[PDB]
Design a protein around this ligand. Structure first.
Ligand SMILES: *SCCNC(=O)CCNC(=O)[C@H](O)C(C)(C)COP(=O)(O)OP(=O)(O)OC[C@H]1O[C@@H](n2cnc3c(N)ncnc32)[C@H](O)[C@H]1OP(=O)(O)O
Ligand SMILES: *SCCNC(=O)CCNC(=O)[C@H](O)C(C)(C)COP(=O)(O)OP(=O)(O)OC[C@H]1O[C@@H](n2cnc3c(N)ncnc32)[C@H](O)[C@H]1OP(=O)(O)O
Lengths: 177, 177
C-alpha cells in the first residue's frame, strides 16, 4: 500500500520491515521531538519501536488509526499518521513528524495534503484534526497551508517536558462529493 | 466506594449489582438520550448493559476512566462519569445523563461539582472537559454553573441521529493546592 505524493515523495503503510530504519530515525531526533511529542522518551531500544509498530499496524488494518512512513527518493524521511479514527463521526486526529534533515522542503505540507485528499475521496474521513502545542509554529504553518481552521485553544491540555502546555485544535472538513 | 454529594444524594462506583436497575433506567430514557449520546441505540438487552458495565469497572479500577451511579434517597437517578482519563495530562473527559424524572432539581449540577472537587483534591485530575452538541442547552447550563470555560466549537464533530453536529468543548482547570 503506497499513496503517491510527488515525483520524489511517497507514503508507504507501516511495515515490520521499516522497524530498524525507523528506530534509528527516532533515535536521531528524539532529543528535539520530545518537546512536542510524548512517546519519544519511552523509546530506547529497537524492541520498543517494533512494539509501537506492530500495534499501529493492527489499528491500521482495522481502520482505527493509520501509520504511514514518508519516503523521499527511497529514503525514510518521517512519519505521517491518523493517531485515532472515529468511524462513526468520519473524524480523524492527525499526528506527524519529520527527521530534522528533511525539513524546510515542504515535504510534510505536501504529504498531508495528499493523505487527506485520498481519505476524503474514499469517504471514510471527512473531518481532519490537528492538536499540538500552541507554540509549535512549524506545525501550525503546515495546518494553515492545508487550510485547517483553528477551532479552539485547550488550556494546559498537554504535559510535555515537565510542564503543561496550551494546545491549539485545528480542523478541516472535506466533503469529496 | 461512595462520594457524598448532599443529604439526599450520593455517587456510588459502578457495581455489577447495579446492572439490572441501570438497564431499566437506560430503557426508560433511550428514546430521548439518543439525541445527544451515541451508545443508547446499541443497548437492547440487559446482557449489553452488563457488558458496558464490566468494561467500565475495569477502566475504573485502572484509573483510565470512571463510572459513578447517582443515587437520590437510595434510588438510582442517573450516571456521572469520566469517559476517558489522560493520566499524564491529569485531564479527564466528562460524560453524564439523568433519568427524565430526576431532572430540573440541580441534581447533576451538584453531583458534578462534588465529583470534580474530589478529584482535583486528590490531585490526579486537574483539567476537566465537557464536549456535547452545541445545542444541548441543559448540559451547557450544567457546565457554566460549574464554571467551565468554552474553549472552542468543533464543527460537525459528532454523528448523532442521522446527522453531523457541531460540538462545544467546555473546560475547567482546578489546582486544589
Ligand atoms: S504536535 C503535532 C505536530 N508534530 C510535531 O510537531 C512533530 C515535531 N515537528 C516536526 O517534525 C516538524 O517541525 C513539522 C513536520 C511539524 C514541520 O516541519 P517542516 O516545517 O519542515 O514542514 P514541511 O515539510 O511542510 O516544510 C515547510 C517548510 O519548508 C519550506 N518550503 C520550501 N518549499 C516549500 C513548498 N514547496 N511548500 C511548502 N513549504 C515549502 C518553508 O520554508 C517551510 O514552511 P513554513 O512556511 O511551513 O514555515
Ligand atoms: S453530550 C454530554 C451531556 N449529556 C447529555 O446531554 C445527556 C442527556 N441529557 C441529560 O441527561 C440532562 O439534560 C442533563 C443531565 C444534561 C441536565 O439535566 P438537568 O437540566 O436536570 O440538570 P440538573 O440536574 O443540574 O438540574 C438543573 C436544573 O434544575 C433546576 N434547579 C432547581 N434547583 C436547582 C439548584 N439548587 N441548583 C441548580 N439547578 C437547580 C433548574 O431549573 C435547571 O437548571 P438550568 O439552569 O441548568 O436549566
Amino acid at each position: 500500500e503506497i499513496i503517491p505524493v510527488s515525483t520524489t515523495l511517497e507514503l508507504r503503510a507501516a511495515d515490520e520491515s521499516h522497524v530498524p530504519a525507523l528506530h534509528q530515525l527516532v533515535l536521531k531526533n528524539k532529543a528535539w521531538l520530545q518537546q512536542s511529542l510524548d512517546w519519544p522518551q519511552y523509546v530506547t531500544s529497537q524492541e520498543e519501536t517494533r512494539k509501537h509498530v506492530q500495534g499501529n499496524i493492527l489499528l491500521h488494518q482495522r481502520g482505527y488509526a493509520k501509520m504511514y512512513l514518508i519516503f523521499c527518493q527511497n529514503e525514510m524521511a518521517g512519519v505521517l499518521s491518523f493517531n485515532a479514527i472515529e468511524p462513526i463521526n468520519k473524524a480523524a486526529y492527525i499526528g506527524y513528524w519529520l527527521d530534522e534533515s528533511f525539513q524546510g522542503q515542504g515535504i510534510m505540507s505536501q504529504s498531508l495534503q495528499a493523505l487527506m485528499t485520498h481519505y476524503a475521496r474514499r469517504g471514510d474521513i471527512r473531518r481532519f484534526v490537528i492538536k499540538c502545542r500552541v507554540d509549535n509554529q512549524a506545525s501550525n504553518a503546515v495546518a494553515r497551508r492545508n487550510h485547517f481552521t483553528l477551532e479552539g485553544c485547550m488550556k494546559q491540555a498537554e504535559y510535555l517536558n515537565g510542564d503543561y502546555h496550551d494546545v491549539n485544535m485545528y480542523a478541516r472538513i472535506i466533503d469529496a462529493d
